[PDB]
Amino acid sequence: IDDSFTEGGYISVFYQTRIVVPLSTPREMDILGFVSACNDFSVRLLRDTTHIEQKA
């Protein structure tokens, strides 16, 4: 749960050196993210999820 004490931190992406494209080339790139767990990950204390609601 979004919690003040057990915060995770922050992640950001910046330009170190700008994207340089030659002429007759598209001038608007796109980057796609991906998030996964590493081999040391783990969870516990099963609970219910708020993403699904049986309306009425």
Binding site: F34, N39, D40, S42, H51
Partner: protein, 278 residues
């Protein structure tokens, strides 16, 4: 199990460049924290036991609510026995947990929790009731009256629950005709042949008798009192010895019926958030 120990690491100057990969292939990067950061040795105690399939499913979940009444003999209205077709698609939570995966072999454990209550303003007396819970496999006759021959349970297994005692419970093995329960089925049960009437061969999409488990009929054995007494049996289903195959992405929008359909206005799961905002 003790997860892998986080081994130590230090400054490096090599050219292996494990950090950079190519996602074009279908293999995820096995990179670990020691590779891209100076890491200190750490003895690992955490274990993934709680997250296994059994521990993830080792909890009964309500799958239906069956209403059965015992109308007063004063009122001519007939008794209401509940016939519920066996399925886990009446609710969402168990359905959503199961629909992570495509196939599943799991023994089942059903628990029936019964409750009762008077309805007429007259605070009358009703002696302790006995409920019959009979399983009618696919084909066996469906009871049509609360006091017809079909309730003899000559071959249909049945439970007699005396209201006020510990909730009823029974286990069942894997009863699938196939080699695994088919949570999803892309196909039909009939193929519309080119040389027959259109009506013939018309079957609902993704509907097959793989999930054909018969019905469950619940009645109040007691003959009617002078005061109506309603009751509601709740069925809690626990998968035991569960094995699952072919994972899938969890449902994001609210369910709509047995299929994979979604309603018109439900197609907005995500929430507003500016791109550059922590």
């Amino acid at each position: 199990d003790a997860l892998p120990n986080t081994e130590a690491s230090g400054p490096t100057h090599s050219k292996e460049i494990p950090a950079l990969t190519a996602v074009e292939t279908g293999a995820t990067n096995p990179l670990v924290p020691s590779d891209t950061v100076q890491t200190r040795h750490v003895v690992q105690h955490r274990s993934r036991s709680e997250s296994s399939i059994e521990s993830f499913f080792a909890r009964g979940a309500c799958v239906t609510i069956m209403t059965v009444d015992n109308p007063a003999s004063t009122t001519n209205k007939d008794k209401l026995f509940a016939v519920w077709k066996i399925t886990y698609k009446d609710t969402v939570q168990l359905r959503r947990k199961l629909e992570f995966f495509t196939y599943s072999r799991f023994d089942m454990e059903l628990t029936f929790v019964v409750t009762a209550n008077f309805t007429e303003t007259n605070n009358g007396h009703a002696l302790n009731q006995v409920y019959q819970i009979m399983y009618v496999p696919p084909g066996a006759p469906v009871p049509e009256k609360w006091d017809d021959y079909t309730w003899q349970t000559s071959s249909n297994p049945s439970i007699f629950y005396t209201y006020g005692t510990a909730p009823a419970r029974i286990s069942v093995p894997y009863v699938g005709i196939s080699n695994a329960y088919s949570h999803f089925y892309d196909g039909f049960s009939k193929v519309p042949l080119k040389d027959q009437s259109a009506a013939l061969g018309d079957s609902l999409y993704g509907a097959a008798s793989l999930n054909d488990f018969g019905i469950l009929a619940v009645r109040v054995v007691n003959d009617p009192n002078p005061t109506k007494v309603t009751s509601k049996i709740r069925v809690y289903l626990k998968p035991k010895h569960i094995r699952v195959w072919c994972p899938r992405p969890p449902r994001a929008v609210a369910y709509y019926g047995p299929g994979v359909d979604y309603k018109d206005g439900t197609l907005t799961p995500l929430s507003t958030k500016d791109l550059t905002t922590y």
